[PDB]
Amino acid sequence: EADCGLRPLFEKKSLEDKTERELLESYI
Amino acid sequence: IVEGSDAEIGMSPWQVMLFRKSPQELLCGASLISDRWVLTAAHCLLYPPWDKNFTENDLLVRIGKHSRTRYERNIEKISMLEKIYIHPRYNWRENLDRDIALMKLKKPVAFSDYIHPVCLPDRETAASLLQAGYKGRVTGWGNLKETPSVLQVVNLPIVERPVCKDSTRIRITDNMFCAGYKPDEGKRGDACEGDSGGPFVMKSPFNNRWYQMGIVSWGEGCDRDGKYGFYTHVFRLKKWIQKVIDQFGE
């Protein structure tokens, strides 16, 4: 909770999840 | 979740399962905001219209889970509930206004690959992210249809307040938002029954953290054209969240 919203298996490993990009482009 | 997909492992590690002890029954979603505090919807605990008034001892929280049914040996963690807190202005009679609750865990959890907490949005983040047409993500082990082996996911657009409002006769409220696709959009997806308490989350393009913006609260049917899922506006209610969470010693 100073580490919040950073996922050990994704962000923490610089991997992106399958559908995360959809959320990112939604901001454009 | 309707029209969703199987989550990946560790994709939503703040996913918390709200689980009834006896009969053994998966009852809602919920989300991890610290080692010690779990957020769900109030209706998952207290809903008089249906003679539901769960106490701490009736319920379990299962954390780190992926399979809906399967015990996950050194993965899932189970806590009893120390204390339940429902928003004082939760309106179950009318419209599930302020459909929010906190659960303080008896056995705080260790973070792992499968268990990690989500962020709650600060004002700037909520104003930046909670914008119509921006997409967030819902997850749950809820029904796949109004008429799941594994945790379900779907991303979906926030809907503008007026479209939300005319979608339903239920009096809409500023402590709710809605989401899902408009019929002309050519994509589906919704939460459904048993997804409640589950997180609606958004990934800040600014700090790459997940922020929980909503809580699966209600709908009318699931994935219905011209209908949207309704969400407890977490940030509208963060004053109460902070008050309950900040009260005690570490």
Side-chain angles (χ1 to χ4, degrees), chain A, chain B residues 1-144 146-250:
Chain A
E1 23 137 36
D3 223 5
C4 71
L6 297 170
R7 307 169 288 182
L9 252 26
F10 297 90
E11 284 87 17
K12 254 40 176 298
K13 300 199 190 276
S14 308
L15 295 170
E16 128 187 71
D17 71 51
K18 318 229 242 252
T19 75
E20 192 189 304
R21 202 166 286 198
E22 165 157 40
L23 307 178
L24 204 220
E25 310 294 349
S26 78
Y27 298 144
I28 294 319
Chain B
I1 305 283
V2 186
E3 292 289 328
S5 63
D6 289 14
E8 292 143 84
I9 284 152
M11 209 200 196
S12 173
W14 35 79
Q15 201 74 205
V16 173
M17 225 183 219
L18 217 228
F19 200 86
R20 183 184 202 160
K21 280 184 199 182
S22 187
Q24 287 258 120
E25 179 185 318
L26 164 171
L27 69 81
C28 273
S31 74
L32 215 239
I33 56 188
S34 66
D35 64 353
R36 192 175 303 211
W37 279 101
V38 171
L39 205 59
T40 188
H43 92 254
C44 291
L45 307 153
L46 179 51
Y47 196 64
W50 298 350
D51 210 48
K52 172 135 83 190
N53 191 4
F54 289 110
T55 61
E56 289 83 345
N57 305 336
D58 296 340
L59 314 169
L60 290 193
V61 103
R62 294 169 71 174
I63 310 171
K65 284 199 66 48
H66 177 62
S67 172
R68 173 176 133 265
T69 45
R70 280 301 184 240
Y71 181 82
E72 293 163 300
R73 191 158 177 274
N74 280 117
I75 290 172
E76 70 171 284
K77 313 287 188 189
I78 301 180
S79 179
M80 304 311 135
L81 299 203
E82 196 188 307
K83 225 262 174 282
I84 291 162
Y85 301 74
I86 286 155
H87 192 284
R89 277 168 75 58
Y90 166 38
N91 189 348
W92 54 266
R93 304 172 193 261
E94 202 179 344
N95 58 1
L96 292 177
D97 184 24
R98 293 186 198 79
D99 184 13
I100 190 161
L102 281 162
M103 299 175 300
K104 168 59 171 317
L105 305 192
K106 257 182 209 183
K107 182 171 294 167
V109 117
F111 306 149
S112 62
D113 291 345
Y114 317 103
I115 294 158
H116 193 72
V118 67
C119 302
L120 306 184
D122 48 290
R123 189 148 228 129
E124 176 172 286
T125 298
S128 292
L129 263 23
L130 228 247
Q131 302 215 74
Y134 292 178
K135 282 164 181 190
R137 176 182 277 178
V138 199
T139 40
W141 287 286
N143 294 352
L144 307 154
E146 323 172 340
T147 102
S149 54
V150 135
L151 178 62
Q152 293 296 287
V153 203
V154 70
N155 300 333
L156 55 84
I158 285 133
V159 173
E160 33 289 282
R161 187 137 241 107
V163 182
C164 297
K165 151 148 177 278
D166 316 321
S167 69
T168 193
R169 296 165 190 282
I170 296 155
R171 191 199 125 245
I172 288 339
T173 259
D174 288 333
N175 320 303
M176 303 165 189
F177 67 89
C178 86
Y181 295 96
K182 296 169 168 168
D184 76 0
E185 293 196 277
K187 281 175 148 234
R188 309 213 68 84
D190 187 10
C192 199
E193 283 79 26
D195 288 322
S196 285
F200 181 114
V201 301
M202 297 191 81
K203 175 152 165 162
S204 176
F206 306 115
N207 73 176
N208 95 317
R209 298 179 174 247
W210 294 81
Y211 282 85
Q212 178 173 359
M213 317 288 321
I215 300 164
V216 172
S217 179
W218 60 280
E220 285 161 284
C222 300
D223 198 45
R224 273 145 82 151
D225 278 358
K227 298 317 276 245
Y228 311 83
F230 277 87
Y231 294 88
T232 308
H233 202 310
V234 164
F235 179 86
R236 285 269 308 182
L237 305 179
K238 206 185 181 183
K239 239 178 77 268
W240 170 75
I241 292 168
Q242 213 65 173
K243 288 191 184 197
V244 339
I245 278 186
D246 274 2
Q247 205 193 156
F248 311 121
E250 193 284 318

